[PDB]
Design a protein around this ligand. Structure first.
Ligand SMILES: [Ca+2]
Ligand SMILES: [Ca+2]
Lengths: 233, 236
DNA sequence: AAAGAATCTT
DNA sequence: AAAGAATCTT
């Protein structure tokens, strides 16, 4: 299974290799920072070749966005199964945890908005989630093991987005779907709040931007289900 | 001075080294992406040791933010004169073959002395911007012996150190994220400091009173000329 | 252009 | 929670 092999490959790479700096062609090494801004960029680069290997192993073509502001990080597809593409997106958080699962105002409400391929052709939306416990000169190659690593214990999971999605927004002005606020294992096990991928889509598709507005609609799943029960009114 | 030395230091470092990938303690190397989110991070990390080096050469303590949404990237100051701190922020943008930068938020520390800033805004006497401009240029991993084989994610890169106010423009750099926009000019004007403001006082006031949407400022000011007219009218 | 896409803090 | 802080595309 692509998914089976991918998570095993990622889980394995994570376990066997520790990123500790950026290197120049001339061999000079610059240490890393402890900002998620830095580490998220790192975790994506660390993931790229592994995703590529497993995909090719399964006959999948991997495409990355051409222009920025486009989802997802990696689009996987067989030329024979063009309308059954799978979306893989890298997400990071640090230390219960929570992730911002992308916007609810672009591709989920508009088939072609801010997405490499029309939302139509994807049959799966996976999230490779990384969590790290947060913890000034250069080094030569001969010092790789001496460079202080900017994190304590990174963990990685592979889950379906709809399965780890929560009912509360992940961000305000940038309108992101928020994930469940739970322990790492709950992500691996897929202990979400939605009963189906459809309920997930419907919910974030009609979620109002501010609590002012969703005060008169729904602010959580229970209220959403009541809103559903009465006739979406 | 610290400023000249730093600028000299940055130029020389950028000339001598080409960042090409991330390296593991085990020696495996993962290539770099060619997207500015990746490159911004890289360039920031590349600058840190040089900045720290020179600062130390001048007697300055370098402090980075303890929290994430906090300006600036680096705060330099002598412990003898803590009220005279220097803010240094790393900015990045790209060219395909005139450029522009997003110079920071206009609703945070500039309007509130302690909002989203490491130290109260009033303790900084200078706000420097180290700007990187790369001309936009693998899927495998490498070993330490293959460094010359790893693809460089940029065709070229230039760096400048300039006063934030000097390069600021009158049009916003971002909408929802309310960022100050820089001048839309050729790299040389950034180095030359050919801005639009008469002084830093005018720069600060313009951004402290800039309305976030067209409608709002439509009845105030959209550009420098209109701002100057707004001043004439009595800040009305 | 101006507006709005692309994880964290109080 | 909430809401708003932290380069790109049209
Ligand atoms: Ca990406
Ligand atoms: Ca991502």
């Amino acid at each position: 299974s692509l998914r089976s092999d991918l998570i095993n490959a990622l889980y394995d790479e994570n376990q066997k290799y520790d990123v500790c700096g950026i290197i120049s062609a001339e061999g000079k090494i610059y240490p890393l920072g402890s900002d998620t801004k830095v580490l998220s960029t790192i975790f994506e680069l660390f993931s790229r070749p592994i995703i590529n290997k497993i995909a090719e192993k399964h006959g999948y073509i991997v495409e990355e966005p051409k222009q920025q502001n486009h989802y997802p990080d990696f689009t996987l597809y067989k030329p024979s199964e063009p309308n059954k593409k799978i979306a893989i997106d890298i997400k990071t958080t640090y230390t219960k945890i929570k992730f911002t699962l992308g916007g609810y105002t672009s591709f989920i409400r508009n088939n072609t908005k801010n997405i490499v391929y029309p939302f139509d052709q994807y049959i799966a939306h996976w999230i490779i989630g990384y969590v790290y416990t947060r913890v000034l000169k250069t080094y030569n190659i001969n010092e790789l093991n001496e460079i202080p690593k900017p994190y304590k214990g990174v963990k990685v999971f592979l889950q379906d987005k709809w399965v780890i999605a929560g009912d509360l927004a992940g961000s305000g002005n940038t309108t992101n779907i928020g994930s469940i606020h739970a322990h790492y294992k709950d992500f691996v096990e897929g202990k979400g709040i939605f009963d189906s991928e459809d309920e997930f889509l419907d919910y974030w598709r009609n979620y109002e931007r501010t609590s002012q507005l969703r005060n008169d609609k729904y602010n959580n799943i229970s209220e959403y289900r009541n809103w559903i029960y009465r006739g979406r009114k």
